[PDB]
Amino acid sequence: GGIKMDTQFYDSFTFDNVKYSLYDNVYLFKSGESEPYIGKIIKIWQQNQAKKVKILWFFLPDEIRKHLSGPVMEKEIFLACGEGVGLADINPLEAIGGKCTVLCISKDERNRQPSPRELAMADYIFYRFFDVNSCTLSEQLPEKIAGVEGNLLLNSKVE
């Protein structure tokens, strides 16, 4: 008969003395950019000995400033949603540059309301979702984003 396994996937790894897990939020620097991007790991696998992560993007206010009609909170960022260019990008695992603590304050029922402790330790907070097609912000979380169920893209199920 014979056995042949297909693609190896992962839930976690350690890189440069930091443990990263699926659905963690991370910094990623592009060459020539002064500020890092912030994104969420939504897949980890190995492909031809190369280690890859699929990153679902967050947007900092400066990154979508041209589409914003109103103000933002000091630590606010926005989770990409919808379908189209800008939603997500496959990245080398080696481009990950650190963990980012991002807390969701959405009233959506799939989000666990964060504790004061979690909010106190957050690098960024979000409750709005940037549709990359319309390029518009909404407080409505879609059923899924990038094929991932929405309840996996918010706060951890347990503090």
Partner: peptide
């Protein structure tokens, strides 16, 4: 905390974003 890497991130942006 952030830490710049030698290997660059890959990212596309929506129109008039970035």
């Amino acid at each position: 905390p952030p830490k710049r890497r030698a290997i660059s991130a890959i990212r596309k942006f929506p129109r008039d974003c970035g």
